[PDB]
Amino acid sequence: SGSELARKLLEASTKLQRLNIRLAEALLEAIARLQELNLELVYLAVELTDPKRIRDEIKEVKDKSKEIIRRAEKEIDDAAKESEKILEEAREAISGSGSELAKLLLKAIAETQDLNLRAAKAFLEAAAKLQELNIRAVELLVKLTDPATIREALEHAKRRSKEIIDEAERAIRAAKRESERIIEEARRLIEKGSELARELLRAHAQLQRLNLELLRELLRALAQLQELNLDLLRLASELTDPDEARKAIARVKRESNAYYADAERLIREAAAASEKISREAERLI
């Protein structure tokens, strides 16, 4: 009686992909909150010229920034515990049966879910660090006035942003490499193979490919948002005309919202594509 066991596993896979989509939603909207704060940073830099007040305004951004990051890290940790429950429902239903095969499958799904969480962590980590970096650059810009110091401040921000994106990118790549191994090893184990196992492994692999591609696309969107931020740091430090500088910020605001919508769009495609796989997999049972 493998089909019943096969269903509990598919049931676990389907709950997990939906869980990871939700996680991807939450992390995108966290990115959205931080970018809002980055735009406000430039607004208060171009607008306010009183050091004392702008010092108070900066700290409010910093404080709000921390609470946003903290909520996202909690969202990740809550997903970690939801993943724990889902899998514990899969082990219990499977513990009474005898198949080390059923176990073997569940091990793969459990291991891959860890990589999704660590990949998600890395995505939030790049966002948080870029936010902190932009905070300090503006902190420095609003004080620095002589160009040579300004230029180095911008150039440091540009170097550090790339390093942070690189670290994220590399963290996502290794997540994909290790996810494919779990999957490939599991499939070599099936052939050592029940067609149910085949299909349900195939579906899960598609579901993990979709999730990790999405996180890659979302990182790309973040790297372009940050690209706009560097541009805005430049014009803000250099533009002496406030009303003109305010227009530059509105353009970036225009592009940033467009980038959200592209990003949010990929999420919906992932949700739709994911549900497609789960149902086709469900048809075999």
Rg (CA), the chain: 23
Q: Please name which of 184, 174, 177 lies closest in space to residue 205, comparing C-alpha atoms.
A: 184
Contact 76, 23 (CB under 8 A): yes
- Amino acid (one-letter) located at 105: L
What own/partner pairs with CB < 8 Å and gap ≥ 24 does 110-114 have? 111/182, 112/179, 112/182, 112/183, 112/204, 112/208, 113/16, 113/20, 113/83, 113/87
Written as one string, the DSSP assignment of 126-151 is HHHHHHHHHHHHHHHHTT--SHHHHH
Q: Please name which of 9, 32, 3, 264 lies closest in space to residue 113, comparing C-alpha atoms.
A: 9
What own/partner pairs with CB < 8 Å and gap ≥ 24 does 259-266 have? 259/221, 259/224, 259/225, 260/28, 260/32, 260/221, 262/221, 263/28, 263/31, 263/217, 263/218, 263/221, 264/28, 266/214, 266/217, 266/218
Solved using: X-ray
Q: In units of Å, what resolution does this entry have? A: 2.1
CA distance 60 to 172: 32
CA distance 217 to 69: 20
Q: Which two tokens stand for residue 149?
A: 């110091």
Contact 140, 153 (CB under 8 A): yes
Q: Do you know the residue count of the chain?
A: 285
CA distance 114 to 85: 13
Q: What angle do CA 220, 37, 66 make, to 5 degrees?
A: 95
Residue identified by tokens 């490499």 is 177
Residue 192, classed as helix, strand or coil, is coil
Which are the contacts of 83, defined by CB distance < 8 A and separation ≥ 6? 16, 19, 113, 117
Within 10 angstroms of residue 195's Cβ, the number of other Cβ atoms is 10
For residue 96, give Cα distances in angstroms to 92, 116, 190, 248.
7, 28, 21, 64
CA distance 239 to 80: 46
Within 10 angstroms of residue 24's Cβ, the number of other Cβ atoms is 25
